[PDB]
Amino acid sequence: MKEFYLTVEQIGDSIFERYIDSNGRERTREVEYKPSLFAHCPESQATKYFDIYGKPCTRKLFANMRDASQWIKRMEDIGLEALGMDDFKLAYLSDTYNYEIKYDHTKIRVANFDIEVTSPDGFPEPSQAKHPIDAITHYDSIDDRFYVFDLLNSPYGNVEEWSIEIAAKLQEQGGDEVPSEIIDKIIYMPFDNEKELLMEYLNFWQQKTPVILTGWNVESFAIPYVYNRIKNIFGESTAKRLSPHRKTRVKVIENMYGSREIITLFGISVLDYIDLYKKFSFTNQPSYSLDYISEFELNVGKLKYDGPISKLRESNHQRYISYNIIAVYRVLQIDAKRQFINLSLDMGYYAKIQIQSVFSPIKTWDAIIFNSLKEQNKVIPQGRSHPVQPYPGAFVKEPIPNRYKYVMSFDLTSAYPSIIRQVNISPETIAGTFKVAPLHDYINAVAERPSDVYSCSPNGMMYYKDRDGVVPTEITKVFNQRKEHKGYMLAAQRNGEIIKEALHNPNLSVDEPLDVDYRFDFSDEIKEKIKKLSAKSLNEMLFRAQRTEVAGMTAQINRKALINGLAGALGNVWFRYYDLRNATAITTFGQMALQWIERKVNEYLNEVCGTEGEAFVLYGDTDSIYVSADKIIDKVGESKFRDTNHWVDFLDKFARERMEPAIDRGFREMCEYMNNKQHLMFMDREAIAGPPLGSKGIGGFWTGKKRYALNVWDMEGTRYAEPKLKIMGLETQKSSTPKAVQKALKECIRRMLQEGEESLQEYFKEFEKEFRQLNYISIASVSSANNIAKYDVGGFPGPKCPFHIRGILTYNRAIKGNIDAPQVVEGEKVYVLPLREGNPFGDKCIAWPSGTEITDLIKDDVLHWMDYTVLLEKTFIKPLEGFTSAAKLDYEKKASLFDMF
DNA sequence: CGTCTAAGCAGTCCGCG
DNA sequence: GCGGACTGCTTAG
Ligand SMILES: Cc1cn([C@H]2C[C@H](O)[C@@H](COP(=O)(O)OP(=O)(O)OP(=O)(O)O)O2)c(=O)[nH]c1=O
Ligand SMILES: [Ca+2]
Ligand SMILES: [Ca+2]
Ligand SMILES: [Ca+2]
Ligand SMILES: [Ca+2]
Ligand SMILES: [Ca+2]
């Protein structure tokens, strides 16, 4: 097998690399790597190295990396560009792995751990580490074992050994329900004291040194706590054994409001699962506790125990250890579903970066572009300082707020990357500028043709057409990977709908799920067998199809995110290829394309309908258009359709055979107008929307920009067994909206779109009547809480104090002097509840950490003083009023002359 | 901590004769 | 009451 790196570090003048050798063994080596950098030189001087603009360069080979770094400094002092890859480990990887890396995940040691720390005086601060570590569970991917390190003797209590037999039993048997599939994989080690636990842990770590280190909040809690505790007990040298190169560094992580410290472990790649989740899941959650995320992703019940966590070990050590093991397993289960570790390895090895650098699209793209240019003996420019400057973005059409009955949508495939490719936007393809007209003049095709030689964007930029730039070339590669995975995702989705249909008629037999690849559309033979399967089999198949769909989604969306990140990186001042001319070439071209195609679609549809000046495009945002299909449906007549699916077919065909050809023609003309390199504006049909045939549903409504709802029957070729709501921007989609309120508003919208005014009124009346029975958590608002200190004036709100911050200050007074009460964490999320006039808390709201029950000290008082009336008006009635006025509907029945009877 | 801009709504403060 | 200037938060793309 071909070799591949595991980790790489620069330590002084040495590269330290852990790698898999040609025999599949893990190895480590120290290499005194001599880097090269570059300077411009005279043309008379013969060289094979050229910068991206074709100017000749001389290569400078340095005795060591510190010499190369010192040279860069002196070049700045002189005021001359020092070219080349200044991150010497990326250059090392590029020299050492000069081929497309093929990696074998089975050789990569992926460690997942969690620690427990009993603490009587509040949250155990990692930087102090003053309390014993009393449990570690550490799962190793190579061994496939959970290694459990259990402290039996502590100043906070002596306990009995954990019992695997009790752990396996049902909760209903008094057990902990540790899943049976991991029971046999647990290696349990009790310890007499904390020193021996820790020494043994470090010896184990030495034996089985993580390459990828993950877990939940490991980077901000577990790692710094372990490091600092070992440091406190044994000294620094012992703690540095967590690094294979015995090198660590306290790293300061800064944001807008403050800073925190983490421990960098040289020769380990830390991918904290909470951060993988936030980057790759495309969710925004009310809470990021493992309990909350586990329940959301896996539908497993919250880990239930009595008393505070600080007393759990002494009261129920059995449960304490079991829950520590289950916590590690839940992370593995989330990853089995989401596959973020797989994704990270894929992207990291593709770009040839330290795996942990996948969190930074700038670093990822810098590496991809560098490797691409180095292949042609080209030399990358030096990174420079730029002041942050605002620049213009997308166009968004102002919609007329209303109901809209039949709607077809279309949008560009990979909009911004396709613009890059079409126009040929790249640092080295800049050909010059042209004299710009107002955008409106390009949109309406009255402006002079920008160029007869170069490829243009209406921001004034021109690009070479003779050869693809490195940015278009490399973006195309990733786009092509994205397209492949999206294919698998959509197949699994369509396959899921076939199973759903079949579940309407399950067979009465005993059988098994079919062994199939859900990434490919089911053959006729498979469809036939599915029609004969039991519900049990079909449900197992649906689960597997949906798991396949999730895996395709992870793979496709994050490749989408990467290529879109390059468009944005051009407007980031830390990017080597930062250029506002290129960033705005993309956004301004995007603005033109949307308004251009709006004009063309309106013109086309007025022609087919025989009208003039009618607005068929009702809305658009960035790269999308929403087209009213009412007139299309009415030309055939609703009476002529057999069912809903009949008109959906009709619109799908109309979109495919009439709309898309017309759109393509419009865009080909625009490509000629801008003289672009290649026509790549592909605006495919997204959604087909409308009410159920024969119903009084309104189909859809807009309230404003970025706020709408549609009843969708077909999405990107997926024909649903049951219609699905596409809701954007409305309160049902916001993590700040109470859980139960999200649910109720969605049901109100469903009724509006599917059933009509009377149905909505019946539901509203019921919700208003019963909502006071809803659990307090389900009706609490949610907000992030920043700058709590700024607004705190002696425990009370200062000027301009935000509502949620006021809530926190109320909470802080209510729990004052109590070290055991949960503290609100600056920058994290809180639940927020309004309080009625005259409450003992002395203010109008209270807030507490999200994902938690409010502390028992004050719970009963909060429940007693909760303002249900204010809550209802603010979170439910107000948004509903917004939806219904926009839709021209009433949520409460207005009096009529029939009331006389 | 980690690409980008556009733009919505909640709430504070205060004007609006 | 609403709305504008402003801060804060959160989405859509
Ligand atoms: C969703 C999203 C879009 N954008 C920008 C770049 C996108 O090309 C552009 C349009 O967004 P989308 O239409 O959401 O994305 P897309 O066109 O890249 O992909 P698809 O083929 O799935 O339609 O907006 C971001 O910068 N960040 C984002 O998170
Ligand atoms: Ca715990
Ligand atoms: Ca798109
Ligand atoms: Ca599409
Ligand atoms: Ca059947
Ligand atoms: Ca879109």
Side-chain angles (χ1 to χ4, degrees):
Chain A
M1 45 153 284
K2 280 281 190 77
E3 305 177 58
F4 62 95
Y5 66 95
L6 296 167
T7 65
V8 64
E9 302 289 0
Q10 186 189 333
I11 304 173
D13 286 325
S14 286
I15 288 303
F16 284 80
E17 183 199 6
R18 296 171 67 194
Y19 67 105
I20 294 298
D21 70 13
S22 51
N23 289 311
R25 270 93 170 253
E26 179 176 337
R27 311 278 297 275
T28 307
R29 64 189 163 200
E30 181 180 349
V31 179
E32 312 171 67
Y33 180 64
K34 314 261 265 269
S36 297
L37 300 173
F38 299 81
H40 288 125
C41 63
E43 197 195 23
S44 58
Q45 187 201 297
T47 189
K48 66 167 170 183
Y49 310 100
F50 296 92
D51 81 5
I52 66 174
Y53 311 103
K55 308 257 84 162
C57 286
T58 178
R59 185 162 67 90
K60 296 196 192 282
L61 186 260
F62 295 93
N64 53 64
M65 288 175 295
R66 284 141 170 189
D67 278 5
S69 289
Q70 291 323 108
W71 182 76
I72 293 167
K73 278 170 195 275
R74 288 187 311 264
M75 288 293 278
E76 177 192 9
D77 290 351
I78 301 173
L80 291 163
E81 192 184 1
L83 297 85
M85 171 54 71
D86 54 319
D87 186 348
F88 303 128
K89 61 207 175 295
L90 296 178
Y92 171 84
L93 290 180
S94 191
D95 282 335
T96 306
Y97 302 92
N98 193 21
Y99 47 87
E100 183 177 21
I101 294 162
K102 178 71 194 156
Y103 74 89
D104 177 351
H105 79 90
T106 77
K107 310 291 201 155
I108 303 175
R109 195 173 298 273
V110 183
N112 200 291
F113 85 120
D114 186 63
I115 73 171
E116 302 298 338
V117 176
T118 294
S119 180
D121 50 29
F123 183 82
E125 287 297 351
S127 56
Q128 312 284 119
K130 67 185 197 185
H131 306 101
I133 294 167
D134 55 33
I136 307 178
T137 293
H138 180 121
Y139 173 85
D140 184 281
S141 71
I142 288 181
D143 297 342
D144 191 20
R145 296 291 184 269
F146 298 80
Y147 295 89
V148 181
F149 298 80
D150 182 11
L151 179 63
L152 306 186
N153 299 305
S154 151
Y156 306 140
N158 301 328
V159 299
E160 294 307 313
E161 280 188 29
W162 169 83
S163 168
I164 198 155
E165 295 83 11
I166 292 163
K169 287 175 172 160
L170 304 169
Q171 297 273 353
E172 296 88 359
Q173 281 176 285
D176 307 315
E177 266 163 39
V178 172
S180 46
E181 75 271 14
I182 73 166
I183 282 297
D184 289 325
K185 299 181 180 188
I186 296 166
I187 294 180
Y188 172 71
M189 297 158 286
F191 294 90
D192 185 77
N193 62 81
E194 196 201 353
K195 287 196 197 77
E196 76 182 24
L197 184 158
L198 289 169
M199 286 186 296
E200 191 58 52
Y201 188 64
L202 287 170
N203 289 150
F204 156 91
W205 189 279
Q206 216 148 291
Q207 279 298 297
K208 300 164 194 296
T209 301
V211 167
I212 301 306
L213 186 56
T214 190
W216 200 261
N217 278 306
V218 293
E219 188 179 71
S220 62
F221 182 71
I223 299 158
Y225 202 99
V226 171
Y227 182 86
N228 286 312
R229 183 73 180 163
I230 292 171
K231 182 160 73 62
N232 282 338
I233 294 165
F234 299 102
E236 271 211 310
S237 78
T238 301
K240 295 166 177 291
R241 289 176 53 206
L242 292 170
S243 161
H245 316 309
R246 310 300 181 251
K247 174 143 162 72
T248 70
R249 158 167 282 109
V250 174
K251 190 187 181 190
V252 66
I253 301 300
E254 297 185 342
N255 57 48
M256 219 151 66
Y257 331 100
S259 72
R260 56 191 183 85
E261 287 171 351
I262 67 173
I263 305 304
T264 298
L265 304 171
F266 278 69
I268 311 261
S269 283
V270 176
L271 305 175
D272 193 335
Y273 218 92
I274 195 174
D275 299 320
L276 294 173
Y277 191 88
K278 287 179 196 185
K279 183 181 169 51
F280 293 136
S281 82
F282 291 90
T283 61
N284 190 14
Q285 300 285 12
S287 166
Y288 290 86
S289 74
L290 187 54
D291 253 354
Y292 198 94
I293 303 300
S294 290
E295 175 160 354
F296 179 88
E297 291 293 325
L298 307 173
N299 225 306
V300 290
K302 155 224 71 188
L303 258 36
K304 193 247 99 194
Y305 62 91
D306 293 336
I309 190 179
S310 58
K311 294 182 181 173
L312 185 53
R313 186 183 165 269
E314 60 175 313
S315 61
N316 199 342
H317 172 254
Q318 174 67 33
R319 178 140 288 168
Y320 191 75
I321 296 309
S322 282
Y323 280 8
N324 177 233
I325 297 162
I326 296 169
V328 170
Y329 190 44
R330 295 292 186 245
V331 182
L332 299 161
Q333 290 175 110
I334 294 160
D335 196 57
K337 180 188 188 197
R338 291 293 200 147
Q339 296 169 200
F340 296 150
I341 301 292
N342 179 78
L343 174 67
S344 296
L345 296 171
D346 276 359
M347 296 181 41
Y349 286 120
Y350 180 86
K352 297 177 178 161
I353 54 181
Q354 300 189 117
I355 305 303
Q356 68 269 31
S357 289
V358 302
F359 286 108
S360 166
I362 288 157
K363 193 57 145 183
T364 305
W365 281 114
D366 196 43
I368 289 164
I369 290 157
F370 155 65
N371 280 284
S372 187
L373 292 173
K374 176 171 161 279
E375 273 296 289
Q376 317 154 265
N377 291 325
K378 289 171 181 181
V379 176
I380 67 178
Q382 189 173 24
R384 286 163 161 84
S385 263
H386 316 279
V388 176
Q389 284 188 290
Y391 70 92
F395 174 76
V396 183
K397 185 181 175 60
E398 189 75 67
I400 301 169
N402 205 345
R403 64 179 75 178
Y404 292 92
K405 190 178 186 204
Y406 292 103
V407 178
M408 287 176 313
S409 62
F410 308 75
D411 73 281
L412 294 171
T413 299
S414 283
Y416 282 10
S418 295
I419 291 166
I420 285 161
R421 293 167 63 209
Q422 158 148 348
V423 182
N424 201 33
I425 297 169
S426 201
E428 85 285 19
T429 51
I430 295 175
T433 65
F434 65 91
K435 197 160 79 174
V436 314
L439 191 66
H440 162 92
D441 289 348
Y442 294 113
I443 293 157
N444 293 303
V446 283
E448 203 197 349
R449 199 155 180 260
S451 180
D452 291 321
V453 181
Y454 302 118
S455 170
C456 300
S457 171
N459 79 322
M461 295 296 289
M462 315 196 290
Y463 302 87
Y464 302 135
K465 298 185 67 170
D466 62 311
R467 53 174 151 91
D468 282 344
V470 65
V471 166
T473 300
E474 296 304 317
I475 221 179
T476 300
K477 285 176 192 164
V478 179
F479 169 71
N480 284 340
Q481 298 166 28
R482 186 260 172 142
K483 186 170 181 171
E484 186 189 341
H485 286 288
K486 191 172 175 183
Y488 303 149
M489 182 199 69
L490 289 176
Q493 209 178 74
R494 292 182 301 259
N495 284 341
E497 297 305 308
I498 296 171
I499 294 157
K500 282 171 192 182
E501 295 276 3
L503 275 160
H504 297 315
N505 299 126
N507 296 55
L508 285 167
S509 69
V510 196
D511 49 27
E512 297 281 7
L514 269 31
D515 188 20
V516 293
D517 191 339
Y518 298 92
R519 300 176 301 162
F520 301 95
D521 286 296
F522 285 156
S523 66
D524 294 351
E525 175 171 35
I526 288 159
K527 278 172 188 164
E528 293 309 282
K529 293 173 186 181
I530 278 174
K531 297 192 183 187
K532 289 174 211 181
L533 282 167
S534 74
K536 178 157 138 50
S537 286
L538 288 167
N539 280 133
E540 185 51 57
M541 289 190 65
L542 181 65
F543 175 84
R544 292 172 187 181
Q546 287 166 161
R547 283 301 180 91
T548 305
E549 192 194 339
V550 174
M553 173 63 96
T554 296
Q556 78 84 14
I557 205 159
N558 292 295
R559 284 171 171 83
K560 165 180 170 175
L562 183 55
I563 56 174
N564 290 346
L566 180 50
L570 295 166
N572 178 303
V573 296
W574 301 109
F575 193 43
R576 190 180 309 271
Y577 311 101
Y578 172 81
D579 193 334
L580 253 25
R581 299 174 301 173
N582 288 343
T584 68
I586 298 163
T587 65
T588 316
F589 190 96
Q591 284 208 12
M592 178 186 62
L594 181 45
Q595 299 167 83
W596 176 278
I597 211 63
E598 172 182 26
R599 177 176 62 82
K600 287 289 197 180
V601 168
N602 280 336
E603 288 176 5
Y604 177 73
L605 287 171
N606 273 284
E607 173 173 277
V608 301
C609 294
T611 47
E612 180 201 23
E614 302 284 300
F616 287 88
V617 177
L618 63 104
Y619 182 68
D621 182 339
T622 306
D623 73 326
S624 68
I625 55 165
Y626 292 76
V627 187
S628 179
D630 295 14
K631 283 174 164 64
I632 303 306
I633 294 299
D634 290 356
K635 252 167 184 55
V636 285
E638 274 170 328
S639 305
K640 278 58 141 59
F641 301 106
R642 289 177 279 97
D643 44 36
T644 302
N645 202 71
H646 191 184
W647 71 256
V648 176
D649 284 333
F650 170 76
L651 290 186
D652 181 36
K653 189 178 179 166
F654 186 81
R656 191 179 49 249
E657 298 181 354
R658 302 303 171 197
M659 302 261 64
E660 280 176 10
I663 284 161
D664 192 71
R665 285 193 302 281
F667 276 131
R668 290 161 104 86
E669 176 174 286
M670 193 189 78
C671 178
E672 289 188 46
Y673 185 34
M674 287 307 109
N675 196 34
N676 299 136
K677 194 172 191 296
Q678 188 176 19
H679 162 60
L680 289 165
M681 297 296 95
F682 308 131
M683 180 174 260
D684 293 339
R685 190 271 288 174
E686 184 218 15
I688 291 175
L693 215 220
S695 72
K696 298 167 178 182
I698 66 166
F701 71 88
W702 267 256
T703 81
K705 288 184 184 177
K706 299 182 193 283
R707 289 183 62 90
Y708 63 93
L710 291 164
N711 188 55
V712 171
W713 299 92
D714 193 290
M715 183 76 152
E716 285 183 319
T718 304
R719 189 66 57 91
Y720 296 124
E722 305 293 342
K724 205 127 96 76
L725 301 175
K726 185 191 187 209
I727 306 164
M728 302 305 310
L730 311 186
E731 281 79 1
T732 55
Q733 312 310 108
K734 299 176 68 165
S735 64
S736 52
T737 299
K739 257 296 149 301
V741 171
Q742 285 179 338
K743 186 169 162 53
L745 290 171
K746 187 163 170 168
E747 181 56 9
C748 289
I749 293 168
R750 191 196 64 78
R751 295 179 173 241
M752 288 164 74
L753 311 195
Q754 293 183 1
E755 301 168 3
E757 193 175 43
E758 199 188 40
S759 179
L760 182 245
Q761 290 168 180
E762 300 186 345
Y763 193 74
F764 170 86
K765 202 208 284 90
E766 207 55 69
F767 188 76
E768 179 176 57
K769 188 150 62 212
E770 319 287 352
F771 86 103
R772 296 175 166 265
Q773 306 158 216
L774 288 161
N775 169 261
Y776 77 115
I777 287 176
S778 82
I779 54 171
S781 295
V782 170
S783 186
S784 293
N786 304 301
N787 276 298
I788 304 173
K790 187 214 270 198
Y791 291 107
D792 188 342
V793 186
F796 290 95
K800 296 221 69 174
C801 182
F803 189 85
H804 64 288
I805 304 298
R806 182 185 291 275
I808 291 162
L809 292 165
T810 307
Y811 177 78
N812 288 355
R813 297 197 299 280
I815 68 154
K816 186 176 85 68
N818 215 295
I819 58 274
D820 29 294
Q823 299 294 122
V824 174
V825 184
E826 165 72 17
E828 296 204 19
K829 301 195 178 185
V830 293
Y831 287 130
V832 185
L833 284 175
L835 269 3
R836 291 195 317 282
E837 194 101 301
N839 67 79
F841 295 103
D843 219 332
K844 51 161 173 182
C845 59
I846 193 169
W848 73 102
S850 71
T852 70
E853 292 269 350
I854 198 167
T855 168
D856 279 327
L857 300 162
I858 60 170
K859 185 177 174 169
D860 58 311
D861 294 316
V862 170
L863 295 174
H864 186 284
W865 287 97
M866 275 180 76
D867 201 326
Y868 289 95
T869 302
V870 161
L871 204 156
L872 184 73
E873 296 283 353
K874 275 158 55 162
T875 71
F876 184 72
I877 299 177
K878 217 184 195 290
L880 185 63
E881 165 67 39
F883 305 164
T884 57
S885 53
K888 305 188 192 306
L889 241 22
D890 292 303
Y891 61 96
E892 290 189 292
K893 191 181 176 163
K894 20 144 264 199
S896 85
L897 285 86
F898 254 70
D899 301 329
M900 306 273 192
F901 299 93

